[PDB]
Each structure stands twice: as C-alpha cells, then as structure tokens.
Amino acid sequence: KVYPLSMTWSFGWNSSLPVYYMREDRRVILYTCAHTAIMYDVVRNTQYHLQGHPNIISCLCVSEDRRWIATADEGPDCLIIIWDSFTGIPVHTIFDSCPEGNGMRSIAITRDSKFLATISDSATQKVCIWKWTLAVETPACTLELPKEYGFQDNLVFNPANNKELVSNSKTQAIYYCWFEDKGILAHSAPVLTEKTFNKLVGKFSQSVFHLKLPQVLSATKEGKLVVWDIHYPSSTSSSAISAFPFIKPRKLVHLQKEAITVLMTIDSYIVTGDIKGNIKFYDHTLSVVNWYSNFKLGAIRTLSFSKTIPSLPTEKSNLPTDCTLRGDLFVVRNFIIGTFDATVYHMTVDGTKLEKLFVEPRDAVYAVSCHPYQPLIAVGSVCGMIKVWDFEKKVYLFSRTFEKGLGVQCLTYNPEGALLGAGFTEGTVYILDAMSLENESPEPFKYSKSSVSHCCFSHDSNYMATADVNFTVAVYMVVVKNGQRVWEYLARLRSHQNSIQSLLFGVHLDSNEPRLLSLGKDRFLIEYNLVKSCKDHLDVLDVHRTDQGNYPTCMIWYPPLTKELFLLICNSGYKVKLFNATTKMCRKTLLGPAYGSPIEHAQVLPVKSTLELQKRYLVFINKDKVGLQILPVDGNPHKTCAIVCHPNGVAGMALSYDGRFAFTAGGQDRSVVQWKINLGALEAAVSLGGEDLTPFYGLVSGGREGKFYRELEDYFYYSQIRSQGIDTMETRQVSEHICLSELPFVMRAIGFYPSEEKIEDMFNEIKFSEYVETGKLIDKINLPDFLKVYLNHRPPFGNTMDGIQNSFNVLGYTNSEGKKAIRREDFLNLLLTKGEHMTEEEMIDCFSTLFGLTPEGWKSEPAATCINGPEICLQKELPEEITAEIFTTEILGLTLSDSSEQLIQ
Amino acid sequence: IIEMQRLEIRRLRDQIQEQE
Amino acid sequence: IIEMQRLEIRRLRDQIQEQE
C-alpha cells in the first residue's frame, strides 16, 4: 500500500501499438507504453494507469462499449489481462495461457462481449477462444496452423456474429468459425494468385467483416480492396463431413494508387486510411463519402471512434458536402487519428478543428538531462527531436527539431543550467542555448567521425569534453576575446584500448582548476592534465589498472563524507570500489546490489542543506532495473532495493534537482518515465534487517551455528597457532585477532581464491582504512571485520564453473571431442611463464600435493624423499590432453551446486 | 528579440561573474 | 522563451543590484 519506488508518468508511446478512444465528453484516451497501459485525460491533465506485465505489452483491444479493456504482453510467461475502464483500478486475468507461446501477437474481443480470442506468437501459431465472462483459465477450443500462412498479426471479431473471426498475415488471410456444440474450431486459408484477375495484388494488411453481407474484406498495400464470400454446408453435405464454411475470393477492385493500411467500420460506414494522409468514409456499396486529407498528417496508424453516439444539431452546423447525387448532411461519431510518426490528434466531429495532442519521439530513445535549479527536464530522440518539459506542470514546452537524419543520444546541462549540450552519432557535437536551443557555435563542432558516447562539462563553464565509440577522447574550451566568450575546438587523443564506460571532469580546489577523467573497459583509468595539455596534445600523465578478471562500468565522484576523498567505480563482478582523489589507489571492496545484473550507471541525489549532508542517497540503473542505495555501502541486501523498467533494456538516468524525483529513458520502447520515491520506506526496509552482524550473519548459511560458520572459526584459531608457531613450550595464547599474512591463508582455507593482487589490495584496505583517523598502520584484524571482507570479496554466490570454462575456451584448442583442451607440457609451461609466474619446483610441489604424493600438511615433518617421484608423476599423473572437466575433478570434490534467489528482497 | 534577450542575459550573467 | 528570458533578465538585473 506504499512503496519506495512508484511510477506515475509516461512520455511517448510506440505508434505501432494501436490507440483506442474511450470517454468522449472529457476526452480520455488509451495508449500502451512498453509493459504498461495508460489512460490520460486531456482537460483534467492527469494520467490513469494499468499496472504492468511480465513483458512488453504486445496487443490490446477495448470493448465496443469502452467499459472493458483487454491486453497481452510478448515474451515468455505472458498473461492476458482485462480491465474495467471506469473502476480505473480493475482486475481480471488469464494465468498461464501458454507455456512456450511468446505472448499473444494479435487479439480481439467480442463486441457481443461474451468471448475473447487470441493469436499466439509461436513458430506455429495458436488460435484459442475464451469465455472471459466466466473465470475461465484454460482454452475453450484450440487450433494450431501451418507456418505457411505467416505472422497472422491482425485479428477482428464480427459484429453480426458470435462464432466468426477473421485474421490475416502480410501474405495469407484466414476465415474462422467455431462450432461449440461440436466443440470444433474450423479454419480455411486459401491462396490467392495472379490467375484470379491476371493482376498485381501483392501484400495485404487488414481484414474485416462487412456491414450487411456474407462477406469478408481485405485491404491491400497495392491500393486495392479484396472481398470474399462465405459458403455454408449444403444440405446434402450435412449427412457427411459438412465441410466447414468455405471462403471464395469473389472480387478485386483498385481504389487509389497510394498504399492503404487501416480499415474499420462504423455504424454502417466503412472507413479507410492511407500511408500519405487521406482518410475516407464509405457506405457498404463502397460509395464515396467525403474524406479528410492533406493536413500535416500522414501514415495514419491509429483510427478510433467515440463511445458517444452523436446527438444531432442542425439549426446551425458545419457539416461537409457528401458526394451523393444530392449530397446530404453527414455526422460521424467523433474519431481519433494518429500517424506513423507518433503524432496524436483529436478531431471535432463537425470538422471545424483538427486538434493535435501531445507529440512524442518517433523511434528510439536516449536519456534526459535536468536543469540544476529549475523544474525543467530535456528529452531527446535518436531522430530530429530534443524537447523540454516542466515535470511538475507535466506541460510540453519548448523544443527544437534537429537537422534531418542526424542520430542523437548524448545530452548534458552545464552545472549552472545556463547551457545545454548534445551529442550526435554522426561525428557531430552541438552546444545549445539552454533557452532557445540556438546553435550557439555558428557551426556545430564536427571534428570526430563516429558516435559520441559521453559528454560532460567541467565545473568551469569554459570547458566541455566528449567521448566517442572509437575509444577516442575530445575536449572543448572557451576563448575570451574582444569582451566576448566564444567556444572553440580542443584537441583529440586516443587513450583507451576498449569501449569507454564513463567520462568525468574533476576539480583541483587545491588550485581552483579543472581536471578530466575517463573510465575504459580496458581495466585502465586515466587522468589528463588540462593545464599542461595543448594543441594536438592532450596531456596524458596517469594510467592505473583498476580491475582484475573483470572490468569497470561506471565512474562518479563519491560524495564528501570524510577527510579523504574518493571516486566510486563499479564492475562486472558486482563489486564497487573507492579510489583516492590523489593517488587513485584503492581501499574499499563492496558487493553491489544483488538484483540480477551488474550496475550500468548511477547518479546522486542533490543537496539542499546540512540535512542532506547528514543523509545521502545513491540512485543506480542496471540492464533492466532501477534501484536506490543509502550511504555508506556495505552490501547489506536490506540496504538496497531495485525495480523493473522497460524490460527490454534501460539506458540512462536523470534526477529532479529538488531531490524528489528520478526519470528513466529506455531505448527501443520509445518511452520515458518519471519515478517518485519514498526514502522512509527504505529506512523501514533497513529496519527489517535489524542491526550489528544480523544481516551479515543472515548472509552466512546457518548464520551463527551453521557447520560452515564453525568450520571457519576453527581456521581463525589454527592460523593463530600458525602465527605463534606450532612448536612452543609456553602456554598457548590466542585472542580476537589474526596477523594479516595469515588472512590470505584463512581466506583460501574457507574456499575463496584471491590473486596476489587481491591480497595486496586487501592489505592496503586494512592498513589504510583506519589510517587517517588514527594516523597509524594497524595489522590486528578481528573476526567481524574479516567476515565483512570475505562477504564483499567473495564471488557473489558459490564459486562457479564459468570462469574456468572461459579460461579453457581462450587458452585451448577444441579437441577431437571439440572440448576446449590444452596439451600437458604446453599447459605446464604456460602456467609457469604467463599470468603470475611460478617457479618450476613450486609448481611441481603444488601438483605433488594435489595428487597427494607428499606427506600431508607440509608444516611439521619432512618430505624430501618425495619430490623425485613428482618428476615422473608430471607425465604419469597428468593426461596428455587436459580439460576443464579433468582439472575440476582434480581441484574439486565440492560439487558447487547452483544458488537460488527468489525469496531475497 | 529572443536572440537579443539571450545576448543581454549573457552580458548580465558575465557582469555578475565580474561581481563574483 | 520570451517570457522566461524576461524572467532571467529580471533575475540578473536584481541580483546585480543586490551585489551592488
């Protein structure tokens, strides 16, 4: 009944998802937006919402009375979900309709309102009918169809029937009738060819039941209509198979040159709409009634007609000349129009205005930037559009249409908000006027030659920088002349050996001065000395390697919480790390949010006051989810939440500068959504985890009594003996602590395998973490903190095969069995020479130990009789071809079975 | 006139930057 | 744009007078 992350906004919708008209008087209209379905009232200026699906919403149809709305989603696990318009918080559902079926790719509901009928996405498609007025949760009747008909993606119900449906693909059309007393659904899908008319007919789009005659209509891209008649069992057939009603292609006629694709029929008119901005109404004779045409309007994909049957004024009225021999009054319902290019309009029934509504991004979507002091947010498409909203007002305001065919993706404000900037996929960069979106530079800057991938301003307005997908950096600077500021190019440099993952500006308050910082996938981090940089010479002076076995993804300033200062970075290991504002060395190991995928990007909520200085919050997105974190991080699951959005992928972040709201832009969903947050709900969730070790104990299997936990605790004592030495004549003594050299031993002893580099990292972490407060190195570590280190450093589950497989797959040939495999001497030599080096005698000792040729423990009694045996054992123990299967049989008696999650918050 | 407003806004914020 | 620019102008003028 309350949530941390609630949704209520939609910007944009996919124009291929057909609109309907519901409540007329107030103007409230229905559109689908990714996995969500939405109602919006123009005059109240408020949205109403239908709450999600397991996948993107695939298809919908509204009852004729606009009381009922039905919807489906694509992908697995699909649900068919039906709704009452005027409760506005309704429910109805069909569970589990199809196991494999990838959601229902077309679906109609009876105007009769008794039945629902559906077409599944599947390699062979399903047809099923559903008595939705009953709480039925299984198909009443079923058929599956040859592939030859193709994707079937239009379906309609017959207003003159209860047991007839039509469907077509691009390339086949189908008639259906359901014999419920027989329990049989029958189909026919006859094949058209040129022979029927010796004429071109080509591809066709939609099919519909005629107004009054035993007929089925099909509309063509060819400018033509096709019509069929149905034939029903002749009486002599009734004694036999009574071959279910057959469809015959009586007639073809050409109605216009231009492509038609829309067809719907209203109150004994037919209505047809075109690729190029002409919409026509007809009487069942196919007689011509006055059309609507040539507005700034095209490829009309959404037609819909009002619930209101028109009352009839005639004393003063505006009606058009019908084209009858006389030409009479003509009064449609009100009706809705919308284009291909996502342009939404309502018509006054009397024609006196063609009124347009919201207008929205055509195609694919990329993430939005907020003004830092004003309730303004800027949205941009790939195509031709950047536009700004006041997200409190929900009002569409200033926008500029951009030059044709340039792709655009990156957007930024400068820290003042006075400037806006955008990045264009064809080698192109603009600076923009945070008012008029004038091209500030008389020409844009077009120095690079492929897609941007980041842009950012310095704290100084005078400097801006971008990344490009060629892994090349570029920087931008202001020059002061004549009392003017002008913007000017600054010089490119290639500094990353893999895809760039973040780009950042930095301040030297130490000198009130600007800094430039870049995150690559190459595990390398760099800073550039702007103040020494010069033309054709970005001054590169600092490279760090910052990840291992993995790669980083995001870079931001950590907020000030400390004397020290940090950058925050995240990696494919689900790890987060802090690096030092001077040395960029590491000391923090964190476990990222468990939620399904690694973090893609994070942004930090703004500060008003000391009250925020007392309480800081971090926002992040992953592949498919958006989530919140309270600082400091410690990997506690209760400390974090994440929620699912546009679940074919999310691609950027933006935050309301008041600190109330966040906005997510998807991609192919063409949709942007606002999110409204309760922090106290997360404080409550934190309280669910309790305090002290309780969360971390909960992370250990069996917590404080699990046999694992006791097994670990012994190693603390055993390693304490090792630190004392096994041989001593004194009293034994132990207390609270192990000495850091033992810590790698204990960590391995539990079952996690840090590299030498990881060891160095952890020793740095322990030494330095206390350092700045104490002034001191410290080297006695206590169990509770060691446990925290393990829990952060460990693989985010049990140890996994996957990296082993990947390593063999890189190193090995595919063998006779194709298995990725390594030859024994090559394998040995590589293990000595490469990676981290091994001494030959060291490696031989290791193998002899693993095979168990030595005496055990290697820590009290001598051995040297053994080692000569291992020389021959290197041949005799190791097979000539080695594989992950063999190597894991040698290393592992542990069957490292797979983890599970579903209960975890 | 809009461009003149942008120019005047620029001049005024530069004058504040001089006051800064 | 015109009206918001006039608001920006007012803001910057008044802040200039405040700093003076």
mmCIF file with all atom_site columns, N, CA and C in Angstrom, chain A residues 624-673:
data_model
loop_
_atom_site.group_PDB
_atom_site.id
_atom_site.type_symbol
_atom_site.label_atom_id
_atom_site.label_alt_id
_atom_site.label_comp_id
_atom_site.label_asym_id
_atom_site.label_entity_id
_atom_site.label_seq_id
_atom_site.pdbx_PDB_ins_code
_atom_site.Cartn_x
_atom_site.Cartn_y
_atom_site.Cartn_z
_atom_site.occupancy
_atom_site.B_iso_or_equiv
_atom_site.pdbx_formal_charge
_atom_site.auth_seq_id
_atom_site.auth_comp_id
_atom_site.auth_asym_id
_atom_site.auth_atom_id
_atom_site.pdbx_PDB_model_num
ATOM 1   N N  . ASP A 1 624 ? 18.213 -3.598 -16.570 1.00 0.00 ? 624 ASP A N  1
ATOM 2   C CA . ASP A 1 624 ? 16.772 -3.759 -16.710 1.00 0.00 ? 624 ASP A CA 1
ATOM 3   C C  . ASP A 1 624 ? 16.011 -3.233 -15.498 1.00 0.00 ? 624 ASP A C  1
ATOM 4   N N  . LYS A 1 625 ? 16.668 -2.541 -14.573 1.00 0.00 ? 625 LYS A N  1
ATOM 5   C CA . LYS A 1 625 ? 16.091 -2.215 -13.279 1.00 0.00 ? 625 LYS A CA 1
ATOM 6   C C  . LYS A 1 625 ? 16.690 -0.903 -12.800 1.00 0.00 ? 625 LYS A C  1
ATOM 7   N N  . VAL A 1 626 ? 15.960 -0.234 -11.914 1.00 0.00 ? 626 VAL A N  1
ATOM 8   C CA . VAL A 1 626 ? 16.420 0.986  -11.264 1.00 0.00 ? 626 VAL A CA 1
ATOM 9   C C  . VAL A 1 626 ? 16.260 0.814  -9.762  1.00 0.00 ? 626 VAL A C  1
ATOM 10  N N  . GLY A 1 627 ? 17.210 1.356  -9.004  1.00 0.00 ? 627 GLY A N  1
ATOM 11  C CA . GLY A 1 627 ? 17.376 0.969  -7.617  1.00 0.00 ? 627 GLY A CA 1
ATOM 12  C C  . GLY A 1 627 ? 18.052 2.060  -6.823  1.00 0.00 ? 627 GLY A C  1
ATOM 13  N N  . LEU A 1 628 ? 17.833 2.017  -5.511  1.00 0.00 ? 628 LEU A N  1
ATOM 14  C CA . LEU A 1 628 ? 18.300 3.045  -4.595  1.00 0.00 ? 628 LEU A CA 1
ATOM 15  C C  . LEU A 1 628 ? 19.182 2.436  -3.517  1.00 0.00 ? 628 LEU A C  1
ATOM 16  N N  . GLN A 1 629 ? 20.178 3.211  -3.098  1.00 0.00 ? 629 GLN A N  1
ATOM 17  C CA . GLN A 1 629 ? 21.139 2.789  -2.092  1.00 0.00 ? 629 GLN A CA 1
ATOM 18  C C  . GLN A 1 629 ? 21.372 3.940  -1.129  1.00 0.00 ? 629 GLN A C  1
ATOM 19  N N  . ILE A 1 630 ? 21.453 3.612  0.155   1.00 0.00 ? 630 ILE A N  1
ATOM 20  C CA . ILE A 1 630 ? 21.776 4.570  1.206   1.00 0.00 ? 630 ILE A CA 1
ATOM 21  C C  . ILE A 1 630 ? 23.247 4.426  1.563   1.00 0.00 ? 630 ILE A C  1
ATOM 22  N N  . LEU A 1 631 ? 23.888 5.554  1.880   1.00 0.00 ? 631 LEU A N  1
ATOM 23  C CA . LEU A 1 631 ? 25.315 5.577  2.142   1.00 0.00 ? 631 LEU A CA 1
ATOM 24  C C  . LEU A 1 631 ? 25.590 5.511  3.639   1.00 0.00 ? 631 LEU A C  1
ATOM 25  N N  . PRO A 1 632 ? 26.718 4.908  4.035   1.00 0.00 ? 632 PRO A N  1
ATOM 26  C CA . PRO A 1 632 ? 27.699 4.219  3.190   1.00 0.00 ? 632 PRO A CA 1
ATOM 27  C C  . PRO A 1 632 ? 27.211 2.854  2.724   1.00 0.00 ? 632 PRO A C  1
ATOM 28  N N  . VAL A 1 633 ? 27.827 2.322  1.674   1.00 0.00 ? 633 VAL A N  1
ATOM 29  C CA . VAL A 1 633 ? 27.506 0.991  1.176   1.00 0.00 ? 633 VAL A CA 1
ATOM 30  C C  . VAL A 1 633 ? 28.219 -0.068 2.007   1.00 0.00 ? 633 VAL A C  1
ATOM 31  N N  . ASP A 1 634 ? 27.563 -1.220 2.156   1.00 0.00 ? 634 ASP A N  1
ATOM 32  C CA . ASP A 1 634 ? 28.175 -2.339 2.863   1.00 0.00 ? 634 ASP A CA 1
ATOM 33  C C  . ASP A 1 634 ? 27.677 -3.682 2.341   1.00 0.00 ? 634 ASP A C  1
ATOM 34  N N  . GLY A 1 635 ? 26.931 -3.710 1.239   1.00 0.00 ? 635 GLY A N  1
ATOM 35  C CA . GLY A 1 635 ? 26.448 -4.937 0.644   1.00 0.00 ? 635 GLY A CA 1
ATOM 36  C C  . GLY A 1 635 ? 25.271 -5.572 1.347   1.00 0.00 ? 635 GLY A C  1
ATOM 37  N N  . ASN A 1 636 ? 24.766 -4.968 2.416   1.00 0.00 ? 636 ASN A N  1
ATOM 38  C CA . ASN A 1 636 ? 23.569 -5.487 3.058   1.00 0.00 ? 636 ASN A CA 1
ATOM 39  C C  . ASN A 1 636 ? 22.407 -5.460 2.068   1.00 0.00 ? 636 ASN A C  1
ATOM 40  N N  . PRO A 1 637 ? 21.725 -6.584 1.835   1.00 0.00 ? 637 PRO A N  1
ATOM 41  C CA . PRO A 1 637 ? 20.634 -6.555 0.849   1.00 0.00 ? 637 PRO A CA 1
ATOM 42  C C  . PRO A 1 637 ? 19.493 -5.655 1.281   1.00 0.00 ? 637 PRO A C  1
ATOM 43  N N  . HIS A 1 638 ? 19.130 -5.709 2.564   1.00 0.00 ? 638 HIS A N  1
ATOM 44  C CA . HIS A 1 638 ? 18.094 -4.829 3.094   1.00 0.00 ? 638 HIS A CA 1
ATOM 45  C C  . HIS A 1 638 ? 18.411 -3.363 2.838   1.00 0.00 ? 638 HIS A C  1
ATOM 46  N N  . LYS A 1 639 ? 19.696 -3.013 2.793   1.00 0.00 ? 639 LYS A N  1
ATOM 47  C CA . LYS A 1 639 ? 20.113 -1.649 2.490   1.00 0.00 ? 639 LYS A CA 1
ATOM 48  C C  . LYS A 1 639 ? 19.748 -1.188 1.084   1.00 0.00 ? 639 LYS A C  1
ATOM 49  N N  . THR A 1 640 ? 19.321 -2.078 0.189   1.00 0.00 ? 640 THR A N  1
ATOM 50  C CA . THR A 1 640 ? 19.110 -1.691 -1.199  1.00 0.00 ? 640 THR A CA 1
ATOM 51  C C  . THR A 1 640 ? 17.804 -2.270 -1.725  1.00 0.00 ? 640 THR A C  1
ATOM 52  N N  . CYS A 1 641 ? 17.243 -1.579 -2.718  1.00 0.00 ? 641 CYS A N  1
ATOM 53  C CA . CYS A 1 641 ? 16.087 -2.031 -3.477  1.00 0.00 ? 641 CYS A CA 1
ATOM 54  C C  . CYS A 1 641 ? 16.337 -1.793 -4.959  1.00 0.00 ? 641 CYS A C  1
ATOM 55  N N  . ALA A 1 642 ? 15.683 -2.592 -5.800  1.00 0.00 ? 642 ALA A N  1
ATOM 56  C CA . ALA A 1 642 ? 15.647 -2.296 -7.224  1.00 0.00 ? 642 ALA A CA 1
ATOM 57  C C  . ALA A 1 642 ? 14.320 -2.744 -7.814  1.00 0.00 ? 642 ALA A C  1
ATOM 58  N N  . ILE A 1 643 ? 13.934 -2.078 -8.902  1.00 0.00 ? 643 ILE A N  1
ATOM 59  C CA . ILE A 1 643 ? 12.616 -2.215 -9.508  1.00 0.00 ? 643 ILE A CA 1
ATOM 60  C C  . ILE A 1 643 ? 12.785 -2.234 -11.020 1.00 0.00 ? 643 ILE A C  1
ATOM 61  N N  . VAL A 1 644 ? 11.829 -2.853 -11.703 1.00 0.00 ? 644 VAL A N  1
ATOM 62  C CA . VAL A 1 644 ? 11.997 -3.283 -13.085 1.00 0.00 ? 644 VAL A CA 1
ATOM 63  C C  . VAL A 1 644 ? 11.353 -2.248 -13.994 1.00 0.00 ? 644 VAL A C  1
ATOM 64  N N  . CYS A 1 645 ? 12.030 -1.933 -15.096 1.00 0.00 ? 645 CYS A N  1
ATOM 65  C CA . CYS A 1 645 ? 11.585 -0.900 -16.020 1.00 0.00 ? 645 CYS A CA 1
ATOM 66  C C  . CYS A 1 645 ? 11.925 -1.289 -17.451 1.00 0.00 ? 645 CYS A C  1
ATOM 67  N N  . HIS A 1 646 ? 11.055 -0.878 -18.380 1.00 0.00 ? 646 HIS A N  1
ATOM 68  C CA . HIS A 1 646 ? 11.224 -1.096 -19.814 1.00 0.00 ? 646 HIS A CA 1
ATOM 69  C C  . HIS A 1 646 ? 11.975 -2.383 -20.122 1.00 0.00 ? 646 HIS A C  1
ATOM 70  N N  . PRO A 1 647 ? 11.439 -3.544 -19.758 1.00 0.00 ? 647 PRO A N  1
ATOM 71  C CA . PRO A 1 647 ? 12.302 -4.713 -19.556 1.00 0.00 ? 647 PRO A CA 1
ATOM 72  C C  . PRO A 1 647 ? 12.758 -5.349 -20.859 1.00 0.00 ? 647 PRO A C  1
ATOM 73  N N  . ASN A 1 648 ? 13.015 -4.521 -21.868 1.00 0.00 ? 648 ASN A N  1
ATOM 74  C CA . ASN A 1 648 ? 13.969 -4.846 -22.916 1.00 0.00 ? 648 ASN A CA 1
ATOM 75  C C  . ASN A 1 648 ? 15.191 -3.937 -22.887 1.00 0.00 ? 648 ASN A C  1
ATOM 76  N N  . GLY A 1 649 ? 15.399 -3.198 -21.798 1.00 0.00 ? 649 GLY A N  1
ATOM 77  C CA . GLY A 1 649 ? 16.652 -2.504 -21.568 1.00 0.00 ? 649 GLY A CA 1
ATOM 78  C C  . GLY A 1 649 ? 16.500 -1.033 -21.238 1.00 0.00 ? 649 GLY A C  1
ATOM 79  N N  . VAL A 1 650 ? 17.279 -0.561 -20.265 1.00 0.00 ? 650 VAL A N  1
ATOM 80  C CA . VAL A 1 650 ? 17.240 0.820  -19.804 1.00 0.00 ? 650 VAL A CA 1
ATOM 81  C C  . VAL A 1 650 ? 18.630 1.412  -19.986 1.00 0.00 ? 650 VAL A C  1
ATOM 82  N N  . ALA A 1 651 ? 18.687 2.724  -20.245 1.00 0.00 ? 651 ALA A N  1
ATOM 83  C CA . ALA A 1 651 ? 19.867 3.290  -20.884 1.00 0.00 ? 651 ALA A CA 1
ATOM 84  C C  . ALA A 1 651 ? 20.275 4.667  -20.369 1.00 0.00 ? 651 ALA A C  1
ATOM 85  N N  . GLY A 1 652 ? 19.699 5.166  -19.282 1.00 0.00 ? 652 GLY A N  1
ATOM 86  C CA . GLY A 1 652 ? 20.276 6.343  -18.656 1.00 0.00 ? 652 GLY A CA 1
ATOM 87  C C  . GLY A 1 652 ? 19.436 6.839  -17.501 1.00 0.00 ? 652 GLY A C  1
ATOM 88  N N  . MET A 1 653 ? 19.947 7.893  -16.860 1.00 0.00 ? 653 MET A N  1
ATOM 89  C CA . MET A 1 653 ? 19.468 8.343  -15.562 1.00 0.00 ? 653 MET A CA 1
ATOM 90  C C  . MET A 1 653 ? 19.371 9.860  -15.545 1.00 0.00 ? 653 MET A C  1
ATOM 91  N N  . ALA A 1 654 ? 18.393 10.369 -14.797 1.00 0.00 ? 654 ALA A N  1
ATOM 92  C CA . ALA A 1 654 ? 18.306 11.797 -14.525 1.00 0.00 ? 654 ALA A CA 1
ATOM 93  C C  . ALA A 1 654 ? 17.495 12.010 -13.255 1.00 0.00 ? 654 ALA A C  1
ATOM 94  N N  . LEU A 1 655 ? 17.791 13.107 -12.560 1.00 0.00 ? 655 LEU A N  1
ATOM 95  C CA . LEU A 1 655 ? 17.277 13.355 -11.220 1.00 0.00 ? 655 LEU A CA 1
ATOM 96  C C  . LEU A 1 655 ? 16.708 14.764 -11.140 1.00 0.00 ? 655 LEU A C  1
ATOM 97  N N  . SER A 1 656 ? 15.535 14.890 -10.527 1.00 0.00 ? 656 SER A N  1
ATOM 98  C CA . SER A 1 656 ? 14.973 16.206 -10.255 1.00 0.00 ? 656 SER A CA 1
ATOM 99  C C  . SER A 1 656 ? 15.837 16.941 -9.238  1.00 0.00 ? 656 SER A C  1
ATOM 100 N N  . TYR A 1 657 ? 16.172 18.196 -9.543  1.00 0.00 ? 657 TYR A N  1
ATOM 101 C CA . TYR A 1 657 ? 17.146 18.917 -8.733  1.00 0.00 ? 657 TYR A CA 1
ATOM 102 C C  . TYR A 1 657 ? 16.628 19.237 -7.338  1.00 0.00 ? 657 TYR A C  1
ATOM 103 N N  . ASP A 1 658 ? 15.316 19.161 -7.111  1.00 0.00 ? 658 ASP A N  1
ATOM 104 C CA . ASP A 1 658 ? 14.802 19.263 -5.752  1.00 0.00 ? 658 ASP A CA 1
ATOM 105 C C  . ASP A 1 658 ? 15.070 18.014 -4.925  1.00 0.00 ? 658 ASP A C  1
ATOM 106 N N  . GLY A 1 659 ? 15.538 16.937 -5.548  1.00 0.00 ? 659 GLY A N  1
ATOM 107 C CA . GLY A 1 659 ? 15.765 15.697 -4.836  1.00 0.00 ? 659 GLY A CA 1
ATOM 108 C C  . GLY A 1 659 ? 14.525 14.874 -4.583  1.00 0.00 ? 659 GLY A C  1
ATOM 109 N N  . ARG A 1 660 ? 13.445 15.114 -5.325  1.00 0.00 ? 660 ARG A N  1
ATOM 110 C CA . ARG A 1 660 ? 12.204 14.371 -5.145  1.00 0.00 ? 660 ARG A CA 1
ATOM 111 C C  . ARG A 1 660 ? 12.042 13.226 -6.134  1.00 0.00 ? 660 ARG A C  1
ATOM 112 N N  . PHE A 1 661 ? 12.496 13.398 -7.373  1.00 0.00 ? 661 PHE A N  1
ATOM 113 C CA . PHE A 1 661 ? 12.035 12.568 -8.474  1.00 0.00 ? 661 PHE A CA 1
ATOM 114 C C  . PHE A 1 661 ? 13.210 12.156 -9.344  1.00 0.00 ? 661 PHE A C  1
ATOM 115 N N  . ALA A 1 662 ? 13.052 11.011 -10.002 1.00 0.00 ? 662 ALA A N  1
ATOM 116 C CA . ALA A 1 662 ? 14.025 10.490 -10.948 1.00 0.00 ? 662 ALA A CA 1
ATOM 117 C C  . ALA A 1 662 ? 13.309 10.114 -12.235 1.00 0.00 ? 662 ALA A C  1
ATOM 118 N N  . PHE A 1 663 ? 14.043 10.156 -13.343 1.00 0.00 ? 663 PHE A N  1
ATOM 119 C CA . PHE A 1 663 ? 13.486 9.855  -14.652 1.00 0.00 ? 663 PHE A CA 1
ATOM 120 C C  . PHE A 1 663 ? 14.352 8.812  -15.339 1.00 0.00 ? 663 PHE A C  1
ATOM 121 N N  . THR A 1 664 ? 13.701 7.847  -15.981 1.00 0.00 ? 664 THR A N  1
ATOM 122 C CA . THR A 1 664 ? 14.373 6.802  -16.740 1.00 0.00 ? 664 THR A CA 1
ATOM 123 C C  . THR A 1 664 ? 13.991 6.903  -18.207 1.00 0.00 ? 664 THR A C  1
ATOM 124 N N  . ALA A 1 665 ? 14.993 6.877  -19.079 1.00 0.00 ? 665 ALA A N  1
ATOM 125 C CA . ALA A 1 665 ? 14.785 6.698  -20.507 1.00 0.00 ? 665 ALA A CA 1
ATOM 126 C C  . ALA A 1 665 ? 15.130 5.264  -20.883 1.00 0.00 ? 665 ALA A C  1
ATOM 127 N N  . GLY A 1 666 ? 14.215 4.599  -21.580 1.00 0.00 ? 666 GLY A N  1
ATOM 128 C CA . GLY A 1 666 ? 14.514 3.343  -22.239 1.00 0.00 ? 666 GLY A CA 1
ATOM 129 C C  . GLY A 1 666 ? 15.264 3.532  -23.539 1.00 0.00 ? 666 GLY A C  1
ATOM 130 N N  . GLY A 1 667 ? 15.056 2.591  -24.454 1.00 0.00 ? 667 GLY A N  1
ATOM 131 C CA . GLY A 1 667 ? 15.644 2.646  -25.777 1.00 0.00 ? 667 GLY A CA 1
ATOM 132 C C  . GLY A 1 667 ? 14.598 2.378  -26.836 1.00 0.00 ? 667 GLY A C  1
ATOM 133 N N  . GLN A 1 668 ? 14.463 1.109  -27.219 1.00 0.00 ? 668 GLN A N  1
ATOM 134 C CA . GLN A 1 668 ? 13.585 0.745  -28.322 1.00 0.00 ? 668 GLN A CA 1
ATOM 135 C C  . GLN A 1 668 ? 12.120 0.874  -27.936 1.00 0.00 ? 668 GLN A C  1
ATOM 136 N N  . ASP A 1 669 ? 11.823 0.869  -26.637 1.00 0.00 ? 669 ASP A N  1
ATOM 137 C CA . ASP A 1 669 ? 10.474 1.125  -26.152 1.00 0.00 ? 669 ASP A CA 1
ATOM 138 C C  . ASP A 1 669 ? 9.998  2.542  -26.438 1.00 0.00 ? 669 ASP A C  1
ATOM 139 N N  . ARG A 1 670 ? 10.887 3.445  -26.843 1.00 0.00 ? 670 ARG A N  1
ATOM 140 C CA . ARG A 1 670 ? 10.498 4.795  -27.245 1.00 0.00 ? 670 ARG A CA 1
ATOM 141 C C  . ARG A 1 670 ? 9.849  5.574  -26.107 1.00 0.00 ? 670 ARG A C  1
ATOM 142 N N  . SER A 1 671 ? 10.172 5.239  -24.861 1.00 0.00 ? 671 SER A N  1
ATOM 143 C CA . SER A 1 671 ? 9.381  5.672  -23.719 1.00 0.00 ? 671 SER A CA 1
ATOM 144 C C  . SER A 1 671 ? 10.289 6.222  -22.632 1.00 0.00 ? 671 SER A C  1
ATOM 145 N N  . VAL A 1 672 ? 9.801  7.250  -21.943 1.00 0.00 ? 672 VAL A N  1
ATOM 146 C CA . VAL A 1 672 ? 10.476 7.844  -20.797 1.00 0.00 ? 672 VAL A CA 1
ATOM 147 C C  . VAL A 1 672 ? 9.467  7.950  -19.664 1.00 0.00 ? 672 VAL A C  1
ATOM 148 N N  . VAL A 1 673 ? 9.916  7.662  -18.447 1.00 0.00 ? 673 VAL A N  1
ATOM 149 C CA . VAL A 1 673 ? 9.028  7.521  -17.298 1.00 0.00 ? 673 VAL A CA 1
ATOM 150 C C  . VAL A 1 673 ? 9.619  8.269  -16.113 1.00 0.00 ? 673 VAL A C  1
#
